[PDB]
């Protein structure tokens, strides 16, 4: 029963919004734990990337107006209102699909990716559906990662994600659910 | 660095519009197609073409480069190479002499490491030089056409595994996935890495030369006697159809090394696991934590495709294929036709008892083997319609005929039973009906052959019949035939997945069973590679002295635990698993007495006195068995404690003995001739940034990790198959994530505020 | 190792040669000047690799 594993490891707020996401796709949560788990991870990682990365009042990155803005984990009715308002404020074209994160320093939209195996291979299967609209961020459970050169994710945050992913990968393989 | 030079060349290809559309349209998948693309015609008869071209002027083709230009145009009136540039490459060609000139007058190259690159070939020369050559013998040899390994390996693996090893050696960045049962050859990888470092030979070759000494080259050959690679390589010289030749190799012991140990290791895991209840659960928990030399047993059983029976049983328990074959005691069977329904029935047998047997129904055929003799079987419902065998050892020719008559379930077999047949195994359990009949007819063979009857021999040139005495005759046993023609080897190429029972029997997916626990061989031998059993239960299958070792060694390790339970004063501390094995060397007649004595002495040290460390260790192993006291109620008392074997094997209670002695002034504890002195949070720095990177060096331990500065990289080997890059800290997750949400809830509330048409600040 | 990928050969070589330079700057094989050279040179290769006809030479 993975429903318990999710309730132990993920926080209350992560789960509620992960279900709210599946409610707008018109799908049943409790009869498909497989999908809900990834949505919680995907949702968790999207926060993690933001969390610590601040920007100071002029325009530089440090650790402690944040550097990123979180889209994933909101209602569609608002998310699109947000995304559209960001694109027209900073003066770039509005993406055709709904993005996950938005960079304030780079003024770019971001799509986060969680994979099991090769980060490089999953990267390319995003390229085929996104061309070069958004900055991709691929993280894998087994310690792989693919990122852009122009992206502004420091060694600190990359750790937070990859460590948490493997921490869940170990807790899955320990109790046989991987 | 090369990096930038690649980009410049790529841009220079994108100038040409044809090459642009190649790289744009053609896929990474299709790379494998376009590399083989050529114009030309593949010309028949290359040997004809070679002789023709070699006689011509300029048959060779030459690669352009700085090294090509150091070859001159002429040399003493001889044309080496040609100018005539082809417009495509702007390139050149040359003649046979051009190569010969290079080997004579050309430049020196860095041929350092060449020996270590082609090591697999150089080991063949090492075998030939040091090998002593024995006597020659002219005589007819029967050559068995067996499946055999052609070339000896450094470490046997499958292609799937060896590739991911080869990758982490030569191409560590591109390797990709960090696999479980792949890295753990870190000894071999780190060894190959440093050996193949200074050389500058083409990687594609290095990979091929690694593959030659890590992948099995197994073909069928006519073989007799030895079945080991270091012999097989020389087979052309070792034997022919009508002669023989003795040979003793370089003598470093390979191939057989793991094959022999793996057999014994598995067999001995079985013998221990059979007895106690739930053999499967023990066979697993043991085999998981067993070791051969350095490799865990999992990877050995999986990689090597040999084994006997116990190997395949242990394989199945852990979870890998074994081989599509069927075994019955000593008999081997491969299904060649037919399929049967094992169907329960009540059966009367000859002696006059009702056994509940399953009856194989339906037409069937089988390729069958036993020992040195091989043959073919045909049976039906409780009837052996036909059997064939080959001229071989009479001991095994007999056993084969018997065991076929058993599994054929012929009514003539069942009627030939005389006397009771209550046979047991090692653990003291009732053998199932047919496994019982097996050992009866192997023992009492003559009772069967009389009941069987005789018929005419088949008059075909290369055949003859046999009788009770296993000799040539014009009479023959009803069904059985012998042939002059020699038969194929065992032969079982394909592999299959299998499930396992509580009693270590292997079940095929259909419902029937193929490999039973009872089918193993009793024959024992010693392990060539050094086995190590980290589990406690298997200490039993050491010797007397080495068990006293491993027990007292376990007490020294877990002193803090045992000494804490001592203060509490309960009877659970005496019932540890380690002391259950120690009872195997105490004679049964005396065990409980020693325990009653030992418990009384350790009780006395708790109540009336203070702690005495050496005696507490000395006496604790004897306390396992239930306390057998005197008739009046008080305990027995002793001076010395005798163990199995006798002579030197005894523990003195008072002070010193050979097995055990403590010197109180210097405080030195001698255990079987081994001295042992008795004098007396960081996992938060666990941020995973990348993967195994050679730049950071060797795998650093805990001590050095504390001294690293905040915000710096390092290599760590974490747990169960994880070689990963790590960074030092520089909050703790849970509070961070909630704060990220509060910033999102901020954004949301303003956008709702906006939907009505307001703002926050 | 026969490589696998549905995407384009060029498209990959661009993405790979990017990261090689990224790593070679951090580890200390290439300088800022040689790195921004590559990122610029590659930048072009991107625009070249997403056209539909001419190479669009310039003056």
From TrEMBL, chain A:
Changes after translation: Phosphorylated on serines and threonines by host kinases, including human casein kinase II.
Subcellular location as annotated: Host cytoplasm; Host nucleus
Residue interval(s) of motif Nuclear localization signal 1 (NLS1): 116-131
Binding site for Mg(2+) 2: 72, 100
Residues that coordinate or bind Mg(2+) 3: 72, 100, 111
Binding site for Mn(2+) 1: 42, 100, 111-112
Superkingdom of the source species: Viruses
Record: residues binding Mg(2+) 1: 42, 100, 111-112
Binding site for Mn(2+) 2: 72, 100
Known role: Plays an essential role in viral RNA transcription and replication by forming the heterotrimeric polymerase complex together with PB1 and PB2 subunits. The complex transcribes viral mRNAs by using a unique mechanism called cap-snatching. It consists in the hijacking and cleavage of host capped pre-mRNAs. These short capped RNAs are then used as primers for viral mRNAs. The PB2 subunit is responsible for the binding of the 5' cap of cellular pre-mRNAs which are subsequently cleaved after 10-13 nucleotides by the PA subunit that carries the endonuclease activity.
Similarity comment: family membership: Belongs to the influenza viruses PA family.
Subunit structure of this chain's protein: Influenza RNA polymerase is composed of three subunits: PB1, PB2 and PA. Interacts (via C-terminus) with PB1 (via N-terminus).
Protein name: Polymerase acidic protein
Biological source species: Influenza B virus
UniProtKB/TrEMBL annotation, chain B:
UniProt main location, coarse: host cell
Domain Influenza RNA polymerase PB2 C-terminal: 681-747
Domain Influenza RNA polymerase PB2 middle per the UniProt entry, residue ranges: 109-251
Gene Ontology process terms (BP): 7-methylguanosine mRNA capping; cap snatching; DNA-templated transcription; symbiont-mediated suppression of host gene expression; symbiont-mediated suppression of host mRNA transcription via inhibition of RNA polymerase II activity; viral RNA genome replication
SS bond list: 266-311
GO CC terms of this entry: host cell mitochondrion; host cell nucleus; virion component
One MF annotation (Gene Ontology) recorded for this entry: RNA binding
Residue ranges annotated for the Influenza RNA polymerase PB2 sixth domain, each copy included: 533-680
Polymerase basic protein 2 helical domain sequence ranges: 253-322
Every Influenza RNA polymerase PB2 second domain range: 40-108
Quaternary structure (record): Influenza RNA polymerase is composed of three subunits: PB1, PB2 and PA. Interacts (via N-terminus) with PB1 (via C-terminus). Interacts with nucleoprotein NP (via N-terminus).
Similarity comment text for this entry: Belongs to the influenza viruses PB2 family.
Name recorded for this polypeptide: Polymerase basic protein 2
Organism from which the protein derives: Influenza B virus (B/Memphis/13/2003)
Gene name per UniProt: PB2
TrEMBL record, chain C:
Protein role: RNA-dependent RNA polymerase which is responsible for replication and transcription of virus RNA segments. The transcription of viral mRNAs occurs by a unique mechanism called cap-snatching. 5' methylated caps of cellular mRNAs are cleaved after 10-13 nucleotides by PA. In turn, these short capped RNAs are used as primers by PB1 for transcription of viral mRNAs. During virus replication, PB1 initiates RNA synthesis and copies vRNA into complementary RNA (cRNA) which in turn serves as a template for the production of more vRNAs.
PTM (free text): Phosphorylated by host PRKCA.
Protein family (similarity comment): Belongs to the influenza viruses polymerase PB1 family.
Residues of the full protein shown: 705 to 752 of 752
Oligomer and partners: Influenza RNA polymerase is composed of three subunits: PB1, PB2 and PA. Interacts (via N-terminus) with PA (via C-terminus). Interacts (via C-terminus) with PB2 (via N-terminus); this interaction is essential for transcription initiation.
Lineage: Viruses, Riboviria, Orthornavirae, Negarnaviricota, Polyploviricotina
Compartmental location: Host nucleus; Host cytoplasm
Annotated protein name in UniProt: RNA-directed RNA polymerase catalytic subunit
Gene: PB1
């Amino acid at each position: 029963s993975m429903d318990t594993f999710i309730t132990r490891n993920f926080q209350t707020t992560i789960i509620q919004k992960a279900k709210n996401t599946m409610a707008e796709f018109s799908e049943d949560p409790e009869l498909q734990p497989a999908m809900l788990f990834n949505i919680c991870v995907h949702l968790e990682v999207c926060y993690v990337i933001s969390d610590m990365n601040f920007l100071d009042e002029e325009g530089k990155a440090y650790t402690a107006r944040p550097q990123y803005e979180v889209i994933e984990g909101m209602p569609r009715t608002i998310a699109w209102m947000v995304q559209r308002s960001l694109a027209q404020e900073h003066g770039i074209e509005t993406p055709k699909y709904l993005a996950d994160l938005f960079d304030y320093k780079t003024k770019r939209f971001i799509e986060v990716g969680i994979t099991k195996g090769l980060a490089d291979d999953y990267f390319w299967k995003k390229k085929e559906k996104l061309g070069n609209s958004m900055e991709l961020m691929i993280f894998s459970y087994n310690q792989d990662y693919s990122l852009s050169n122009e992206s502004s994710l420091d060694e600190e945050g990359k750790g937070r994600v990859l460590s948490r992913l493997t921490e869940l990968q170990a807790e899955l393989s320990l109790k046989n659910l991987w | 660095a090369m990096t930038l030079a690649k980009i410049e060349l790529l841009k220079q290809l994108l100038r040409d519009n044809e090459a642009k559309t190649v790289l744009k349209q053609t896929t990474v998948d299709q790379y494998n197609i376009i590399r083989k693309f050529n114009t030309s015609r593949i010309e028949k008869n290359p040997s004809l073409r070679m002789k023709w071209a070699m006689c011509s002027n300029f048959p060779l083709a030459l690669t352009k480069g700085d090294m090509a230009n150091r070859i001159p145009l002429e040399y003493k009136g001889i044309q080496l190479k040609t100018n005539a540039e082809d417009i495509g490459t702007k390139g050149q060609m040359c003649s046979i002499a051009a190569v010969t000139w290079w080997n004579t007058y050309g430049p020196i190259g860095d041929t350092e490491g060449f020996e270590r690159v082609y090591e697999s070939f150089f080991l063949r020369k090492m075998r030939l030089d040091n090998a002593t050559w024995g006597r020659i013998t002219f005589g007819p040899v029967e050559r068995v056409r067996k499946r055999v390994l052609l070339n000896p390996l450094t470490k046997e693996m499958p292609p799937d595994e060896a590739s991911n090893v080869i990758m982490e050696i030569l191409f560590p960045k591109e390797a990709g996935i960090p696999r479980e049962s792949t890295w753990i050859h870190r000894e071999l990888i780190k060894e190959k890495r440093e050996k193949l470092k200074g050389t500058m030979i083409t990687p594609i070759v290095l990979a091929y030369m690694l593959e030659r000494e890590l992948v099995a080259r197994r073909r069928f050959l006519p073989v007799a006697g030895a079945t080991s690679a270091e012999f097989i390589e020389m087979l052309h010289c070792l034997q022919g159809e009508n002669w023989r030749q003795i040979y003793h190799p370089g003598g470093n012991k390979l191939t057989e090394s793991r094959s022999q140990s793996m057999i014994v290791a598995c067999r001995k895991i079985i013998r221990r696991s059979i007895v106690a209840s739930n053999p499967l659960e023990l066979a697993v928990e043991i085999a998981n934590k067993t070791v051969i030399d350095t490799e865990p047993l999992k990877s050995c059983l999986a990689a090597i495709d040999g084994g006997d029976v116990a190997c395949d049983i242990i394989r199945a328990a852990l979870g890998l294929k074994i081989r599509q074959r069927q075994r019955f005691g000593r008999l081997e069977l491969k299904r060649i036709s037919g399929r049967g329904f094992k169907n329960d029935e009540e059966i009367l047998i000859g002696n006059g008892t009702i056994q509940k047997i399953g009856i194989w129904d339906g037409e069937e055929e089988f390729h069958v083997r036993c020992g040195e003799c091989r043959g073919i079987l045909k049976k039906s419902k409780m009837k052996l319609e036909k059997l064939l065998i080959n001229s071989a050892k009479k001991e095994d020719m007999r056993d084969l005929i018997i065991l076929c008559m058993v599994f054929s379930q012929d009514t003539r077999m069942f009627q030939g039973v005389r006397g009771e047949i209550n046979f047991l195994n090692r653990a003291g359990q009732l053998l199932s009906p047919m496994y019982q009949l097996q050992r009866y007819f192997l023992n009492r063979s003559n009772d069967l052959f009389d009941q069987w009857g005789y018929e005419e021999s088949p008059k075909a040139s290369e055949l003859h019949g046999i009788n009770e005495s296993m000799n040539a005759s014009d009479y023959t046993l009803k069904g059985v035939v012998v042939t002059r023609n020699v038969i194929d080897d065992f032969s079982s190429t394909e592999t299959e997945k299998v499930s396992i029972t509580k009693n270590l029997s292997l079940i095929k997916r259909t419902g029937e069973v193929i490999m039973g626990a009872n089918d193993v061989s009793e024959l024992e031998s010693q392990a060539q590679l050094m086995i190590t059993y980290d589990t406690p239960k298997m200490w039993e299958m050491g010797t007397t002295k080495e068990l006293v070792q491993n027990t007292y060694q376990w007490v020294l390790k877990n002193l803090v635990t045992l000494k804490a339970q001592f203060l509490l004063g309960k009877e659970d501390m005496f019932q540890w698993d380690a002391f259950e094995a120690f009872e195997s060397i105490i004679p049964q007649k005396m065990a409980g007495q020693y325990s009653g004595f030992a418990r009384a002495v350790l009780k006395q040290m708790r109540d009336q006195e203070v702690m005495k460390t050496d005696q507490f260790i000395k006496l604790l192993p004897f306390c396992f068995s239930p306390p057998k006291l005197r008739s009046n109620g008080e305990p027995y008392q002793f001076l010395k404690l005798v163990l199995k074997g006798g002579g030197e094997n005894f523990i003195e209670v008072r002070k010193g003995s050979p097995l055990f002695s403590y010197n109180p002034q210097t405080e030195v504890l001698t255990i079987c001739g081994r001295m042992m002195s008795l004098k007396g949070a960081v996992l938060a720095g666990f941020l995973v940034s990348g993967k195994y990177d050679p730049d950071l060096g060797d795998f650093k331990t805990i001590e050095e990790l504390e001294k690293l500065k905040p915000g710096e990289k390092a290599n760590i080997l974490l747990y169960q198959g994880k070689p990963v890059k790590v960074v030092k800290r520089k909050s703790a997750l849970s509070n961070d994530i909630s704060q990220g949400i509060k910033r999102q809830r901020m954004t949301v509330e303003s956008m709702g505020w906006a939907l009505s048409g307001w703002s926050h600040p | 190792r026969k490589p696998v990928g549905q995407h384009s050969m060029l498209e990959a070589m661009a993405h790979r040669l990017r990261m090689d330079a990224r790593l070679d700057y951090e580890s200390g094989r290439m300088s800022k000047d040689d790195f921004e050279k590559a990122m610029a040179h590659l930048g072009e290769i991107g625009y070249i690799g997403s056209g539909s006809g001419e190479n669009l030479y310039f003056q």
